[PDB]
Amino acid sequence: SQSRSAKAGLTFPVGRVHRLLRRGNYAQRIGSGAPVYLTAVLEYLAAEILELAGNAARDNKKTRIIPRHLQLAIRNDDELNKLLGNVTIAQGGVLPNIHQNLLP
Amino acid sequence: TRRHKSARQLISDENKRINALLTKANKLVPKATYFSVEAPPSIRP
Amino acid sequence: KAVVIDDPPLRQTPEPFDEQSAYNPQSPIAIDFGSSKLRAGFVNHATPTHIFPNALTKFRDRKLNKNFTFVGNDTLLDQAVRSQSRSPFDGPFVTNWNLTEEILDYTFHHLGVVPDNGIPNPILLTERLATVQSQRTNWYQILFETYNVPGVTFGIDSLFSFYNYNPSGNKTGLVISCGHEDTNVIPVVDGAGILTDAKRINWGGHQAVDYLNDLMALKYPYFPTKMSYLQYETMYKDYCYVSRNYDEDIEKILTLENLDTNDVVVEAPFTERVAKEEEEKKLKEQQWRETDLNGWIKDKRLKLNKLIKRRKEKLKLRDEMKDRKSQVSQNRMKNLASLAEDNDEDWLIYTDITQNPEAFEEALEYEYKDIVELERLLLEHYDWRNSILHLFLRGPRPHDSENIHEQHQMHLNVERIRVPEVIFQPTMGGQDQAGICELSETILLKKFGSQPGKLSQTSIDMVNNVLITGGNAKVPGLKERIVKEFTGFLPTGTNITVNMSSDPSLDAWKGMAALARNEEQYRKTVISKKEYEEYGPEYIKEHKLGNTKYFE
Amino acid sequence: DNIQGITKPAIRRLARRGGVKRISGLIYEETRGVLKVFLENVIRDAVTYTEHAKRKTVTAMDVVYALKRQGRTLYGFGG
Amino acid sequence: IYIEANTGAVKRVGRSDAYATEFDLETEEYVPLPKGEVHKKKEIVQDVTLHDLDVANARPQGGQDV
Amino acid sequence: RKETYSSYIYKVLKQTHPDTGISQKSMSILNSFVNDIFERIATEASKLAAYNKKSTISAREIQTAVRLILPGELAKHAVSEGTRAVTKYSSST
C-alpha cells in the first residue's frame, strides 16, 4: 500500500534504517519504534544543518552550497561545534580569528 | 492453595470467560456485567 | 500562623470483646466488609459494636522469635505496627483470602461467640455491584466450608442504606453512593434496584488522597521531609470542600482579597596629587550636600536612574545575544561572513566582534558597583503581588528563603476545590467517563419512558426521593452543588428533595439490621446449605436488594 | 559552606601531588569551578545510566562505565 | 437565542460557554447562560402620535426591514 | 545499486531554500555526517541494550542514547520531535 515514512510523517526512509539496523549486528531483536525514532532524529539533525548552511550560503550572496558555508555553519554554532569538535572537514578552511594584542 | 490472582488479570479472565460464552451462544444478550456497568464517555467537550 | 499536622494520635485502650453469656446461637450477625473499614455487630442492636480499619500485621519479635497477629484497632498501638499494616483488598476486589479468614476469626473471637463445628449464626454480607464470578465463588467456598454457616445473603450497601431510610421496601428513588474506591448511581423502582441502568465511576477517596499527594509532590519538588498517607488524609479531610460553581471560582481564587481568607498554611513537623584631588572632590561634594541636599539628591537620583537604564539595556543586549534565531545573531553572522567572504577601522571592527562572555560579566559587575555608588550618593544627599506564581506557592505574604520554619510550610489555595471536583469532571483525574450530574441527567431525562421535555411519573418519583450515601459524602457543599445542578437541567417547578444522613458511613449496617429485624422479607434472600449443594457455586439469588444474573 | 567541604589543605595536597612548589593565594575559585563541572558531567551521565536501569541508587558500575564513555576509564571497581 | 412571543422576533445572542472548548480557536463568540427564568412577562405603555401612523402608512419606497 | 541519502536531504533542503543547490563535495559531507551519527547512536543503543541483560533494542534505549550523545538543547528538541513522530506512527487508526 503506502510506506511507513508517510505514516509517521517523515521524508527519510524507515524500512531502509530498519534494514541497516537489522544485519548491523547491534542486537538480535529490534523493536518497531526504533527506526521511526532514529528517522525523526536524523530528520531534525539534517534539517538544522541545512538551515544553517542555507543561511551561510545566502550570507555569501552565492546561490549554491559550498563546504566553506558548511564550515561557517558548523563553527559559528555553539553546540553543533560541540557535537562536531572531533571531525575534520573537507575543503572548509578556518574561521578568521586574530588575537587582540597582535593588533597594534 | 491458590495462586495470587491480582486485580489486573481478574478483569482479563472475566471478559475472556464472557467472550467465550458469547461466542458459544453465537454458534445471548448480557444484562448486568462488570463492563456494562461502566460509565460511558461524556458528550460535552 | 501555620497549623502543624502530624500522624494521627495512637489509641491507648486496647479493643475489648463482648461477653459470651449474652451470645445466643440463633440471632443473625451482620458484617460490612468494606475496603476502608469493617463494621460488625449483632442484629438486636441499632449501632454496630465493632468498627475498626481493615488491616493486619504479621508482627515479628526479635527476642521471642514468634510471629504475632494484630488486627484492626490493635494495629493502632505502635507507629511501627501502624506503618506495616496490610489490607486484604487490591483495588475494588479481594486477592488473598488467608488475610480475610484471619480477620474473620479475629472478629468472631471479639463478638463473644462460643461455636461448635463452625458458626451457627447466619451472616449478612455486602458485595460490590456486578461482582466477578470468582469473588462470589470464593466467598461461597470459604463460608460454606470453613465456617459451616446455615444462611448467606448478598447485597449492595447502597441498597441497604436505601432500605434503612425507606423501610417499607417498595419506594422509588435515586441512590448516589461515594465509596472508598468507586462512585455509583443506582436507580430504584418500587424498591427493586434496576441494575441494568446503574453506572459506576472509577474514583473514590483513595484516588482523591493519591491525587492530593501527587499534586503536593509536583508543587514542592525540594521539600525536605517525606509525608505519609495519613497526613495527606488529614489535609484532605480538613481543608477540602466542593465549590458552588467551579467554572467561575478559579477566576477569582488567586486574587489578593480572596487569598486573605481562603488560604491554609500547613507546617511539617520537625526538630599624592590624585589623592589630593579626590579629597578636594569629596570636600566639594560634602559642601554641596550640606549646601543643597535636595538638588544633589535629585542629581544623584537621575544618575542612578541613568545607570539603571544602562544596566537594563546591557541585560537586554545580553539576553538578545543568547537567542540564535534573533536578528542580532543574524547580524553577527553577516559581519562574520563579511570578514570571511570578500585598514585600521576594519581591524578595530574585527577586534570588536570578538566574544565577550566574561567581559560582559565584569562590565555588569562594574555597572552594579557604579549603581551602588549612585545609590550611596542619593542616600548621602519585582513586586511579588504581580506574580501569580508567587501567590500560587507562598500565598499573599512575602517569603523568606532563609527561615527554617518557612522551609517546611505548605499552602493550600487551589487544591481545596480542585481535589473534590473530580467526581463531577472525571477527565481531570484521567478517567474518560461522564460526571455525576451527566449520568443523573441521562438517567432521568432519557430513560424509564421519559422523552426529553416531559417527565414520566417514575422520573418524578425518582427526583422526589434522591438519597446521598457513602463515606466520601463528608465533603461540605456536596448537597447544595447537586441540588443546583439538578434544578439546572430539570424542567421548572419540579420538586427536588435530596436526603443525606448525619453520618453517611453507618447507614449500610443499619440497613442490614433493619432487613434482619423484618422477618417477612428476610426469607427471600437467604441461601441455605442445601441450595449451595444443589445448584453449586454458580448461583445468583434474584431479590430486590442484591445482584442479578449476567444474561437474559 | 556548601562548596566549602573541600578546603585549603586538600587542594594544597592535590597541587603538591601535581609536583608544584609555589601556589597562588587565590587559585581557589577556578579549581572549585572545574571540580564542580567535572562532578556534574560524571554524575549526570551516571544518573542517566541508572535511570534507564530503573535503579534509583547510583552504583559503582554505572560511574565506571560513565568514565569509560568519557575516555577516563577506571580499573578495579568492576568492568 | 431570544424569542418574543407576541411579535415573533428572533435574535441570536451567541453560542453558550458550555461549548467553549470544542476548539482552541473559533469565530463564534461565547456568552454565559441566563440566570433568569426562560419565561418573562411585562406590561408596557406605548405612546404614539397621529403623525407617526401617518408616516408609517405613507412610505413610498416600501416597508423596510427591522 | 550504490546506496546514498541524496534524494531525501535534497527534498528537506527544498522545503526551506528552493533556489539553492548543493555541491558534490558538500553532498558527501552530509552523507558522511548522517552515517556517522547513525553509527554512533546505534552503537550506544546496542551498548545500553547489553547493559541490562536485554536482548531487544526498543525506542527507550534509543531515547536514552540520544539523551547521552547530543548536547542539551539539541537533545530536548530531538526527543520532542521523535516522541511526536512515534505517537503519530503508533496511532495509525
Contact A103 C351 (CB under 8 A): yes
Is A40 within a domain? yes
Beta partners for C500?
Answer: C468
Residue C171 CB contacts under 8 Å (≥ 6 apart), including other chains: C188, C190, C191, C465
Q: In angstroms, rounded to a whole number, what is the distance separating the alpha carbons of residues C428 and C201?
A: 13
Q: In angstroms, rounded to a whole number, what is the distance separating the alpha carbons of residues C499 and C465?
A: 8
Q: In angstroms, rounded to a whole number, what is the distance separating the alpha carbons of residues D71 and D73?
A: 6
Q: How many residues does chain E have?
A: 66
Biggest CA–CA distance in chain A, Å, is 70
Chain C residue at shortest CA distance from E37: C492
Chain F residue at shortest CA distance from D55: F52
**Beta strand pairing status for C183-189 and C173-178?**
antiparallel
**Structural domains of chain F ordered from first start:** 1-93 (1.10.20.10)
Q: How was this structure determined?
A: cryo-EM
User: Phi/psi at C330 (nearest 5 deg)?
Assistant: -65, -40
Chains that touch B (3 or more CB pairs under 8 A): C, E
H-assigned helices in chain A: 4-7, 15-22, 33-59, 67-76, 78-83
Q: How many CB atoms lie within 10 A of CB E10?
A: 9
Nearest to C55, CA basis, from C83, C15, C32, C87: C87
Quoted resolution (Å):
2.9
3-state secondary structure C91-132: CCEECCHHHHHHHHHHHHHCCCCCCCCCCCCCEEEECCCCCC
- The amino acid occupying position C236 is Y
Consecutive H or E run containing C469: strand C466-469
Q: What is the DSSP letter of C551?
A: B
Residue D38 CB contacts under 8 Å (≥ 6 apart), including other chains: none
F93 Cβ under 8 Å from any chain A Cβ: no
CATH no. for residue A66?
1.10.20.10
Is A96 within a domain? no
- The amino acid occupying position C175 is V
Nearest to F37, CA basis, from A78, A20, A45: A45
Does residue C117 contact residue C509 with C-beta atoms inside 8 Å? no
Q: Is D67 exposed, middle or buried (0-12, 13-18, 19+ CB in 10 A)?
A: middle
D1-79: CATH architecture: Orthogonal Bundle (1.10)
Residue C513 CB contacts under 8 Å (≥ 6 apart), including other chains: C30, C43, C45, C46
Q: Is C502 exposed, middle or buried (0-12, 13-18, 19+ CB in 10 A)?
A: exposed
The C-alpha angle A22, A25, A28, rounded to 5 degrees, equals: 70
Q: In angstroms, rounded to a whole number, what is the distance separating the alpha carbons of residues E45 and C239?
A: 55
Q: Which three cell numbers stand for residue C270?
A: 520537625
Q: Do chains C and B touch (3 or more CB pairs under 8 A)?
A: yes
- CA–CA distances in Å: residue C20 to residues A37, A73, C31: 72, 92, 19
Task: Work out how many domains chain A is built from and give that number.
Answer: 1
What is the b/e burial string over C32-50, where b = at least 16 CB atoms within 10 angstroms of the residue's CB?
Answer: bbbbbbbbbbbbeeeebeb
Does residue C550 contact residue C198 with C-beta atoms inside 8 Å? no
Q: In angstroms, rounded to a whole number, what is the distance separating the alpha carbons of residues C225 and E61?
A: 84
Residue C7 CB contacts under 8 Å (≥ 6 apart), including other chains: C79, C82, C228, C230, C231
DSSP string, C296-343: HHHHHHHHHHHHHHHHHHHHHHHHHHT-TTSHHHHHHHHHHHHTT---
Q: Chain C contacts of A73, Cβ < 8 Å? A: none
3-state secondary structure of C29: strand
Beta partners for C42?
Answer: C29
Q: How far is CA F71 from the centre of its chain?
A: 14
Is A92 within a domain? no
Q: How far is CA C461 from the centre of its chain?
A: 34
Q: In angstroms, rounded to a whole number, what is the distance separating the alpha carbons of residues C174 and C444?
A: 10
Q: Chain C contacts of E20, Cβ < 8 Å? A: none
Q: Considering CB atoms only, which of F16, F74, F88 is closest to A8?
A: F88
Q: In angstroms, rounded to a whole number, what is the distance separating the alpha carbons of residues C208 and C39?
A: 23
- CA–CA distances in Å: residue C316 to residues C239, C303, C334, C387: 44, 20, 21, 21
Q: In angstroms, rounded to a whole number, what is the distance separating the alpha carbons of residues B30 and B18?
A: 9
Chain E 4-63, residues with CB within 8 Å of chain C CB atoms: 17, 37-38
Chain B residue at shortest CA distance from E22: B45
DSSP string, C147-184: T--S-EEEE-HHHHHHHHH-TTS---EEEEEE-SS-EE
Chain B residue at shortest CA distance from E17: B45
Q: In angstroms, rounded to a whole number, what is the distance separating the alpha carbons of residues C127 and C136?
A: 9
Q: In angstroms, rounded to a whole number, what is the distance separating the alpha carbons of residues C240 and C219?
A: 17
Residue B7 CB contacts under 8 Å (≥ 6 apart), including other chains: C90, C91, C92, C93, C95
H-assigned helices in F16-58: 24-51
Q: Which three cell numbers stand for residue C215?
A: 499534586
Nearest to C176, CA basis, from C463, C546, C550: C463
Q: In angstroms, rounded to a whole number, what is the distance separating the alpha carbons of residues C203 and A24?
A: 49
Does residue F40 contact residue F47 with C-beta atoms inside 8 Å? no
Q: Which three cell numbers stand for residue C506?
A: 453507618
3-state secondary structure of F86: helix
Residue C149 CB contacts under 8 Å (≥ 6 apart), including other chains: C118, C119, C121, C122, C123, C143, C529
Is A99 within a domain? no
Is A66 within a domain? yes
Torsion sign, CA atoms C285, C289, C291, C295: positive
Q: What is the DSSP letter of B45?
A: -
Q: How many CB atoms lie within 10 A of CB A74?
A: 24
Nearest to A93, CA basis, from A60, A65, A71, A61: A71
Q: How far is CA C25 from the centre of its chain?
A: 44
Q: Chain B contacts of E20, Cβ < 8 Å? A: 45
Q: In angstroms, rounded to a whole number, what is the distance separating the alpha carbons of residues C187 and C194?
A: 6
Does residue C188 contact residue C162 with C-beta atoms inside 8 Å? yes
Domain range enclosing A61 = 2-87
Beta partners for C50?
Answer: C40
Q: In angstroms, rounded to a whole number, what is the distance separating the alpha carbons of residues C17 and C30?
A: 16
Q: In angstroms, rounded to a whole number, what is the distance separating the alpha carbons of residues C364 and C308?
A: 11
3-state secondary structure of C188: strand
Contact B10 C201 (CB under 8 A): no
Q: In angstroms, rounded to a whole number, what is the distance separating the alpha carbons of residues F59 and A30?
A: 9
Closest approach of chain B CAs to the CA of C144, in angstroms? 17
- CA–CA distances in Å: residue F9 to residues A46, D26, F16, F23: 7, 53, 11, 13
Closest approach of chain C CAs to the CA of A39, in angstroms? 25
Beta partners for C520?
Answer: none
Does residue C504 contact residue C475 with C-beta atoms inside 8 Å? no
Rg of chain F, C-alpha, whole Å = 16
Q: Is C281 exposed, middle or buried (0-12, 13-18, 19+ CB in 10 A)?
A: exposed
Contact A96 C351 (CB under 8 A): no
Q: In angstroms, rounded to a whole number, what is the distance separating the alpha carbons of residues F34 and F27?
A: 11
Taking one residue from C and the other from E, the number of pairs with CB-CB distance under 8 angstroms is 3
Contact B2 C97 (CB under 8 A): yes
- The amino acid occupying position E25 is L
